Design a protein around this ligand. Structure first.
Ligand SMILES: O[C@@H]1[C@@H](O)[C@@H](O)OC[C@H]1O
Ligand SMILES: O[C@@H]1[C@@H](O)[C@@H](O)OC[C@H]1O
Ligand code: NI
Lengths: 339, 346
């Protein structure tokens, strides 16, 4: 079934319940996921109204872009030309600059396919917005099916050569409560390398590092507490994880990562080359989620995209989008319950 | 009473009814008015859903900007610097450029003051959008009260020196049917001069002309057909009216214009220096409004703002907005019944 309701500030809340009684909900404010629940328990972090997101934290669950991550000095080169983007974190451009696409009300259309329901969000980024060449016509289709598969499909077309590499910022917390650390979840990640950060500014350091056999090797399922208790300088730098991981094998068919807690597990599939993991290293912030004060490590992201830092490390990939080319991306979050 | 419902594509429809039973409706898509009715009759032009606006014509009843009108070559000078803006009409920048503010979903909050209800819509124009320096935090408050006054209050603050001069693009049609021309309406307008257009491109000629005692002189009420039937060069150029008129006396207190049909009148008040008037010179386009094929001259706007062309005619004003300065503008459309005797035929 489908239910639409006023989410505040002129935004809508779109809730989908599949045949298995699983409920997932989204909002047009930032083409974002707000909740995902099973048997009354929330699997992800989210607020109860549009206002909360604009006052507390606008990233959770949102479509971020046009470029996800930090861009050193807000500098990108396009067709040999240097372009300066909006700088919203010191000199860096973080998640597309200030008042980016996650803060806008997107238009949308719901398509009921029976076993599957689709919500297609659209937004036009004008040419010059936050320094990005355009216009860029973008759409993010969030879908949910009777197999408990939540899929995200991106599409974009630009009138001019530009850059584009968005992502989904959902934070998972199988504890169903923000006051509870995810240190108890087990994680499996099919990546043998990672991208270290230069320092507290969080820009990339410049190199690619092999993590095989270190506290960050999750090639074999392990509890996050390990990583959390690690003394690797990289973990110590950010007090948790806040880094890009390079997937070993590319393709939408492989389970790239898996987050597990008890009988409940979430598998991640993507056509993207990397997964950026952030473990809500907020310390004492205490953001309130559903009346619960969030704890340091009270959530984990799986941002699928091209790794940030390509500006300095070309081997990472190329985020350019040529005029007239159609950009496409697909990321899947699959829910599973042990019998 | 206040009522809300989905209006299409994710937008909302905000419907207000005052103590006199007069209803008015707005949409967050473009901080726009959709309808205004008296006793079941549409006073303005509008559609029945958001999609229609996007597919037929996105201007009607919309908030337009950041700069309303045409800027020759998209060129503006800002604090000694030349800036080129998005060019969406040949080399011209028309109504802020492509996919501008009128096409966005603005966030909004309603405030019930009893005798007055305010609908404040908000939107941020990011720095560099369509070429405009910013970022610009804008808000448009549409309010309707027990005295049948529909007021539009604009507010804006920029992080950077930029340009700002928006307007409201409502179209009136007292016939309550798009298929009927407004030539049967009577118009009073307190303006002695106008701004001629260079040509078909519609950029300003460069001069300001006195129109006293011509077919465009409406200081004393006259039927609109007098203008429509005119063969003055400017009228023939655009097949109707499509020009800025300079107010003679400035101030929000003065009734600058009055549109009448039988027992109904719309009065226009504003704190702006001009009124840009467009009489839907669409010819045979026939856009459908509530299943009625719109006719040539099937509507009329009263776009209060600083006159377009200031780039070429500095006398018109200055639309610059200094960083940190708070911009404000207020326009009021008031409904009256039996204000005067208007009984004519065509
Ligand atoms: O990596 C980012 C982190 O450092 C913080 O800024 O929140 C958003 C994350 O995606
Ligand atoms: O003046 C404008 C007219 O010439 C046309 O472009 O439609 C919109 C009006 O605002
Ligand atoms: Ni709504």
């Amino acid at each position: 079934s489908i239910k639409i309701r006023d989410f505040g500030l002129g935004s809508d809340l779109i809730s989908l319940t599949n045949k298995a009684g699983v409920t997932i909900s989204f909002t047009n404010l930032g083409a974002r996921i707000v909740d995902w629940q099973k048997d009354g328990k929330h699997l992800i972090l989210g607020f109860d109204s549009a206002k909360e997101y604009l006052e507390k934290d606008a990233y959770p669950g949102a479509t971020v872009g046009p470029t996800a991550g930090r861009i050193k000095d807000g500098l990108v080169k396009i067709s040999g030309k240097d372009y300066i983007l909006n700088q919203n974190e010191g000199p860096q451009t973080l998640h597309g600059g200030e008042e980016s696409i996650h803060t806008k009300l997107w238009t949308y259309e719901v398509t009921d396919l029976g076993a599957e329901v689709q919500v297609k969000f659209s937004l036009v980024s004008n040419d010059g917005t936050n320094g990005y060449p355009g216009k860029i016509e973008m759409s993010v289709t969030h879908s949910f099916d009777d197999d408990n598969k939540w899929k995200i499909h991106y599409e974009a077309i630009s009138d001019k050569d530009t850059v584009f590499n968005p992502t989904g910022h959902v934070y998972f917390n199988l504890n169903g409560d923000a006051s509870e650390s995810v240190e108890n979840h087990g994680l499996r990640l099919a990546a043998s390398r990672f991208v270290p950060l230069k320092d507290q500014t969080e820009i990339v350091r410049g190199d690619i590092v092999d993590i095989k056999n270190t506290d960050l090797d999750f090639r074999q399922e392990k509890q996050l507490s390990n990583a959390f208790n690690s003394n690797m300088e990289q973990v110590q730098l950010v007090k948790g994880i806040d880094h890009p991981f390079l997937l070993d094998q590319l393709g939408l068919d492989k389970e790239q990562a898996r987050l597990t807690l008890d009988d409940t597990s979430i598998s991640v599939f993507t056509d993207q080359p990397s997964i950026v993991i952030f473990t809500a290293n907020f310390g004492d912030l205490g953001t309130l989620y559903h009346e619960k004060k969030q704890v340091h490590h009270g959530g984990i992201t799986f941002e699928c995209q091209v790794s940030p830092g390509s500006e300095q490390i070309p081997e990472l990939g190329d985020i350019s989008l040529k005029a007239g080319e159609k950009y496409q991306a697909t990321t899947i979050y699959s829910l599973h319950t042990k019998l």
